[PDB]
């Protein structure tokens, strides 16, 4: 017999996870975290809060290479950031299977640099999917995991036993108002959302969202200027059945774009989310 092991996932995915250093003038490491190399061009996902207000951003590979990284862009709403470094040599890249559907109870591995001890792998499962996270106000989708996450793990990889990316570790549940200590409660941005946000950031240098300042309707907004208690049955020639699916459609639409909003036909001009 051989020892039960997830070293295969480790060999495949770990080389693609990097140490990220946020340096600020005082230069001195103001904070640190992790990042994932997404493809050969040198694009790297990480968390925004890791690279916020950095004067210089450093990336380090497990193979020893170090790089000054360029901030391509970031998104507060998803707390995601994209970096760029230029490598003549090949780069390690994270295995991605865009067809893989993460399931509750899938074994996962958290790859990151906890407390700057050097790269660490930890093992758990997918505790839950579709979680708003720590903030009820925040309307996001998170994978939940009991793989041990610590300071230094943010921006790093969460992978299944095959080494495929399942998410980006964002944060651990560390707090209660009471001060009770949570155990095994950690969150990651789902990889499909992280990929969509990365592509947006690469293209526009920021996430450009549609805003329409508003299905039953409950200032100076696109809607207000187009012309309460109104019933929107169709938005941009798409049946408004669910309010969640529509607000996602709005987001997608590019600012400056004019669409027909049927209500029981107004011409609205989409604008950027403030």
């Amino acid at each position: 017999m051989t020892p039960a092991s997830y070293n295969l996932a480790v060999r495949r995915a770990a080389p693609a996870v990097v140490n990220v250093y946020n340096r600020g003038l005082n230069l001195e490491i103001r904070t640190l975290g992790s990042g994932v190399i997404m493809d050969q061009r040198g694009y790297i996902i990480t968390n925004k809060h890791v690279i916020n207000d950095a004067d210089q951003i450093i990336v380090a590979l497990q193979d020893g290479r170090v790089f000054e990284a360029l901030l391509v862009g970031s998104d507060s709403l998803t707390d995601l950031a994209v970096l760029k470094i230029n490598a003549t040599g090949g780069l390690p890249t994270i295995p991605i299977n865009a067809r893989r559907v993460p399931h509750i109870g899938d074994v996962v591995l958290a790859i990151g640099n906890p407390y700057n001890l050097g790269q660490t792998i930890t093992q758990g499962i997918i505790s839950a999917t579709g979680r708003i996270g720590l903030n009820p106000t925040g309307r996001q989708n998170f994978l939940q995991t009991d793989a041990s996450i610590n300071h230094g793990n943010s921006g790093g990889a969460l992978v299944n036993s095959l080494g495929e990316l399942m998410g980006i570790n964002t944060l651990s549940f560390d707090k209660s108002n009471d001060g009770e200590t949570p155990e095994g409660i950690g969150f990651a941005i789902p990889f499909q959302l992280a990929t969509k946000i990365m592509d947006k950031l690469i293209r526009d240098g920021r996430v450009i969202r549609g805003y329409i300042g508003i299905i039953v309707v409950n200032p100076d907004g696109p809607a207000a200027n187009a012309g309460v208690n109104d019933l929107i049955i169709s938005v941009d020639n798409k049946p408004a059945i669910s309010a969640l699916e529509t607000m996602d459609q709005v987001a997608e639409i590019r600012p400056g774009s004019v669409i027909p909003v049927v209500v029981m036909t107004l011409q609205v001009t989409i604008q950027e989310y403030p």
């Binding site: 409950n218 969640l244 529509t246 607000m247």
Partner: peptide, 4 residues
């Protein structure tokens, strides 16, 4: 119920 949302805002968008």
């Amino acid at each position: 119920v949302y805002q968008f």
